[PDB]
C-alpha cells in the first residue's frame, strides 16, 4: 500500500503539494502523461517557484522521455533534478535536462548513459527506414546532451557506444549534473 | 489491511507516529514510497526521531541506495529495528541507522552476502557488467566497514557466501548497537 497522510493525501500527492514530482519507474507514455500533467499544473499554480523532479528510473521510451524533456524546457519555472538510486538511459537524459546549476545526485546514486535500443523486422526497405529513424534519434539525443554537458558530440558518441556506468561524482565531472548532494 | 478510527489503514496510522514499515522485498516502488515517507517526516518535524522497522529479504541495490542516501541526508535520526529477518540490502539498511539506535529483536535473523546479478551478450558487454558489479560490491563493503568498525578485508571474507547472524552476533559484529530485550 501507498500510505496516506492527514485533507487526506496519498504520500506522492502530499509531495506534489510542495512542488515535488517523483519519477520512480520505467518511462512509458502513461508515466510521461502524468509527469507532463504535473509540470503543467505546477506552472499554472506558480510560474516563478522551482519544481523538484526526483529521478529513480531505468529509462524507457525515448518519445515519452522527450514529452517530459520538452515540457521541462517550455515551462517558466526552473525544474531541479535529483537522482536517487539510479538514472539510466532516458532517465539520465532527463537528469541532465534540469535547470543549469540545479541538477543533483545523491552520493551513492548511479547514472548510466548508452545509445538508444530498438528493433525492426520485415522487408529490407522497412529495416532501412527503422535504422535511419533510430540513428537520427541518437544524433538528436547526442546533440542535446552535448549542449547540456559541454562535452563534444564526438566524445558523447564514443562514451555512449556501450553501457557506461558513472558515480555521482563522475556524472558531475562529465557535466550531467552540477553538484553531488553531500549529507 | 485493517482500518483504525479520521480513517487510517494501520500503516498510515503508524506513519503518523513517525514509524515506517519495510516489510517486503526492496524494489523501486518500495524505495520510492520509503524515500517519500522519510522526506515527508523530515518536513513535518526536522528534529524528532524516525523509526524504520525492517523485515526484508533485500532486493535491488540501487533501490536500497535510494533509501540509504535519503537516511543519511535528512536531519532527523533514523532508528532501525530488525524484526524477523534483514538480509542482503535489508541488513545494509539495518546497519545504516543512526549510531546507537540500531536494534534487532532477539530471534531476528541478519544475513550478509555479496551482490547478485547477471550479464548476457558480447565479451565486452560481460566485462562492463562484471566491472560494474565489482565496483558496486567495493562500495557496499567500504560503507559496511565504516558502519560496523570491521576492516574491509574482513567484510570481503565474511560476505563471500551467505552469512547468517543471530541478533547477538550482529551486535558483536557492529551491524546493530543493541538487542532489544523485553
Amino acid at each position: 500500500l501507498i500510505p496516506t497522510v492527514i485533507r487526506a493525501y496519498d504520500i506522492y500527492s502530499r509531495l506534489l503539494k510542495d512542488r515535488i514530482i517523483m519519477l520512480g519507474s520505467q518511462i512509458d507514455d502513461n508515466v510521461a502523461n502524468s509527469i507532463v500533467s504535473q509540470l503543467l499544473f505546477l506552472q499554472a499554480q506558480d510560474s516563478e517557484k522551482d519544481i523538484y523532479l526526483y529521478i529513480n528510473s531505468p529509462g524507457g521510451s525515448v518519445t515519452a522521455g522527450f514529452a517530459i524533456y520538452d515540457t521541462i524546457q517550455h515551462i517558466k519555472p526552473d525544474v531541479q533534478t535529483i537522482c536517487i538510486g539510479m538514472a539510466a538511459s532516458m532517465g539520465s537524459f532527463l537528469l541532465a535536462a534540469g535547470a543549469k546549476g540545479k541538477r543533483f545526485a545523491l552520493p551513492n546514486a548511479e547514472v548510466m548513459i548508452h545509445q538508444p535500443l530498438g528493433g525492426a523486422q520485415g522487408q529490407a526497405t522497412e529495416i532501412e527506414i527503422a535504422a535511419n529513424h533510430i540513428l537520427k534519434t541518437r544524433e538528436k539525443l547526442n546533440r542535446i546532451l552535448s549542449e547540456r554537458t559541454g562535452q563534444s558530440i564526438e566524445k558523447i558518441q564514443k562514451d555512449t557506444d556501450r553501457d557506461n556506468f558513472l558515480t555521482a561524482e563522475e556524472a558531475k565531472e562529465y557535466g550531467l549534473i552540477d553538484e553531488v548532494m553531500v549529507p | 489491511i485493517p482500518t483504525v478510527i479520521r480513517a487510517y489503514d494501520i500503516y498510515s496510522r503508524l506513519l503518523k507516529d513517525r514509524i515506517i514499515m519495510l516489510g517486503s522485498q526492496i524494489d523501486d516502488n518500495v524505495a520510492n514510497s520509503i524515500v517519500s515517507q522519510l522526506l515527508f517526516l523530515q518536513a513535518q518535524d526536522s528534529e524528532k526521531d524516525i523509526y524504520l522497522y525492517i523485515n526484508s529479504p533485500g532486493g535491488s541495490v540501487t533501490a536500497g541506495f535510494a533509501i540509504y542516501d535519503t537516511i543519511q541526508h535528512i536531519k532527523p535520526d533514523v532508528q532501525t529495528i530488525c524484526i524477523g529477518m534483514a538480509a542482503s540490502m535489508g541488513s545494509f539498511l539495518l546497519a545504516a541507522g543512526a549510531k546507537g539506535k540500531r536494534f534487532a529483536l532477539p530471534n531476528a535473523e541478519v544475513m550478509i552476502h555479496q551482490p547478485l546479478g547477471g550479464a548476457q551478450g558480447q565479451a565486452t558487454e560481460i566485462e562492463i557488467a562484471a566491472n560494474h558489479i565489482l565496483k558496486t560490491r567495493e562500495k557496499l563493503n567500504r560503507i559496511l566497514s565504516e558502519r560496523t568498525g570491521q576492516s574491509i578485508e574482513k567484510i570481503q571474507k565474511d560476505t563471500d557466501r551467505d552469512n547468517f547472524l543471530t541478533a547477538e552476533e550482529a551486535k558483536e559484529y557492529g551491524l546493530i548497537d543493541e538487542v532489544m530485550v523485553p
Partner: peptide, 6 residues
C-alpha cells in the same frame, strides 16, 4: 531534499 531542493 531541502535545502536547497526544496
Amino acid at each position: 531534499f531541502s535545502p536547497x531542493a526544496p
